[PDB]
With several copies, the nearest count.
Chain A
Amino acid sequence: QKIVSMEEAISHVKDGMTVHIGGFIACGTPESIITALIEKGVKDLTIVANDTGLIDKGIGRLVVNNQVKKVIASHIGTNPETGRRMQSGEMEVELVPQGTLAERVRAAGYGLGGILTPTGLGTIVQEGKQIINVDGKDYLLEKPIKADVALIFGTKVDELGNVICEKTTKNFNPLMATAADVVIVEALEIVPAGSLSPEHLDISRIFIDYIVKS
């Protein structure tokens, strides 16, 4: 019921949307979903991701294809095109400290209004941030990041939507799956409903809207 075609899924990724994309340097990125969106050619996206991958791997493929208006990431060094589009003025890029990025995506999914982090103080990250003093020490108020759609990845996905992200394919995937309106998981393998233990899961079914196979 939640298992659909790739074309049915990418019908929900529409122009201008903010999109969470799981993946740490493409480790745990839904590559099949990405190539589909290369075919559809959706424009003016805001991608929220650990990094922009490579020019030939991952979120980077969207970047080089003029499909990304703005990038919210922690790292862009592995993709010299992001670097180029940033300095040229084409793409806007907010460089978010990785732990802050985790708490910011998580906050959207968990109903939090923000989190207080000491990471950033006295640096460029402080600019545009409210400083809250708690028990004498200063913190940055970092704000939730809800997105329209999350494109997440699972090495195994049962038919109800429960997801397993093995080894280091977890990253932001289990966080991103809570913090968007429409979550699409790209499954490596579709196990049967209940095949996976209630103790071994990374993402509950109640977070997944559509499952696609790679």
Chain B
Amino acid sequence: MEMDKNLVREVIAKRVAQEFHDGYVVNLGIGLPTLVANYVGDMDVIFQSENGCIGVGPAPEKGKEDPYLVNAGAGFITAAKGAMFFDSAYSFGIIRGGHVDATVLGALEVDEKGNLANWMIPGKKVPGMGGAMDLVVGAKKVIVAMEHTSNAIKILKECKLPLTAVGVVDLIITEKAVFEVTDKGLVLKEITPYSSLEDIKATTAADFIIAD
């Protein structure tokens, strides 16, 4: 039986927020990772939006909304203390140059070599990569936050969907598990009270090893 979607989003999001530290520059993608914004609590996280902001603020109170100030999903935002707006070449020197400390994205597939597929389903959904290749190529820590299954196995041995980048994914975070991607391959690092290694085994196609 499938879990309540809001509860899976909540456990994934809260676990991603544990990976940051005060001063991290963080880029969150549209969808699941935008909720990580609520559990960052009092960390000194600086949110960066690819359309040209460093120091994204929370949404504005209804009536103070600015269509000249949106985020990467075109939703109204404010500007935190110390923010800077910029053109998108500068935006993507931040992203491609290794100044984003952690980008959190979701994924259709992800494999044990670290490859990531998340921008296209051939013939069904073709939205374009947007800033996603640049983000995963350039970020220091690539965190994939996703539903462990979609209905269908997502953590494979080798991705079959059109790739987003090769060898980018550092962390995989599902409702079931925390995988770490290393040179050896996938390493199970955490299990959530919503699953057991017996369950992870038959919902994960990639071989993997276990820590202590």
The residue that A25 contacts in the complex, of B74, B91, B99, B132, with Cβ under 8 A, is B74
Task: Enumerate chain A interface residues (CB-CB to B < 8 A).
Answer: 24-28, 50-51, 73-78, 83, 86-87, 95, 97-103, 106, 108-112, 117-125, 155, 158, 160, 162, 165-175, 178-179, 193-194, 196, 198-199, 201-202, 204-207
Contacts of A25 in B (CB 8 A): 51, 70, 73-74
Residue contact B69 to A168, C-beta cutoff 8 Å: yes
Mark interface residues in B28-58 (1 if CB within 8 Å of A CB, else 0): 0000000000000000001011111111000
CB pair B85–A50 under 8 Å, yes or no, is no
Q: Are B126 and A167 in touch, CB under 8 angstroms?
A: no
A contact patch SS: loop
B99 near A99: Cβ-Cβ < 8 Å: no
Do the beta carbons of B87 and A202 come within 8 Å of each other? yes
Residues of A within 8 A of B66 (CB): 167
The residue from A112, A171, A174 contacting B51, defined by CB atoms under 8 A apart = A171
**B88 engages A95 (CB within 8 Å):** no
> Which candidate, B142-150, B160-168, B174-182, B196-204, is the interface stretch facing chain A?
B160-168
Is B92 a contact of A110 with CB atoms below 8 Å?
yes
How many whole Å from A105's CB to the nearest CB in chain B? 8
Per-residue CB proximity of B87-109 to A under 8 Å, as 1/0? Answer: 11101111111110000000000
Cα A155 to Cα B66 in complex, Å, equals 13
* Bound CA–CA A160/B96 (angstroms): 23
B residues less than 8 Å from A77 (CB atoms) = 125-128, 130
How many residues of chain B are within 8 Å of chain A by beta carbon?
58
Residue of B nearest to A144 (CB): B97
B127 lies within 8 A of A98 (CB): no
Considering only CB atoms, which chain B residue lies closest to A163 in the complex?
B84
Q: Are B99 and A206 in contact (CB under 8 A)?
A: yes
Residues of chain A contacted by B126 (CB below 8 angstroms): 76-77, 83, 86-87, 95
Q: How long is the Cα–Cα vector from A167 to B74 in the complex, in angstroms?
A: 13
Chain A nearest Cβ from B97, distance in angstroms? 4
Q: Which residues of A have CB within 8 Å of B52?
A: 24, 168, 170-171
Interface centre among A162, A166, A170, by most chain B C-beta atoms within 10 angstroms, is A170
A98 touching B84 in the complex, CB below 8 Å, given contacts A25-B74, A168-B52, A175-B89: no
Q: A122-B115, A123-B163, A167-B79 are in contact. Are A111 and B96 (CB under 8 A)?
A: yes
Contacts of A121 in B (CB 8 A): 137, 165-166
B130 touches A111 (CB 8 A): no
17 inter-chain pairs at a CB distance below 8 angstroms, sorted by A residue, are A24-B70, A24-B88, A87-B123, A98-B131, A112-B96, A119-B134, A121-B137, A122-B167, A167-B85, A168-B49, A168-B53, A168-B69, A171-B88, A178-B99, A193-B81, A205-B55, A205-B84
Counting CB contacts under 8 A, is B67 at the interface? yes
- Complexed CA–CA distance, A173 and B127 (Å): 22
- B87, A175: Cβ atoms under 8 Å? yes
Return B183 CB to nearest CB of chain A, in Å.
17
- Contacts A27-B68, A162-B84 given; does A106 touch B96 at CB 8 Å: no
- Most chain B beta-carbon neighbours within 10 Å: one of A28, A74, A77: A74
A125-B133, A162-B82, A201-B84 given as contacts; is B98 within 8 A of A111 (CB)?
A: yes
- Contact status A206-B46, CB under 8 Å: yes
- Residue numbers in A under 8 Å from B163 (CB-CB): 122-124
Interchain CB contact (< 8 A) of A109 among B55, B93, B130 = B93
Residue B209 lies at the interface, judged by CB distance under 8 Å to chain A: no
Indicate if the CB atoms of B87 and A123 lie closer than 8 Å: no
In the docked arrangement, what's the CA distance between A99 and B79, Å?
A: 22
Measured CB to CB, the nearest residue on chain B to A71 is: B128
**Given A169-B68, A178-B97, A206-B54, A97-B88 contact (CB < 8 Å):** no
Q: Are B93 and A110 in contact (CB under 8 A)?
A: yes
Minimum CB distance partner of A118 in chain B: B137
Kindly report which residue of chain B lies nearest to residue A24, judged by CB atoms. B51
Q: Which residues of B contact A119 (CB under 8 A)?
A: 96, 133-134, 137-138, 165
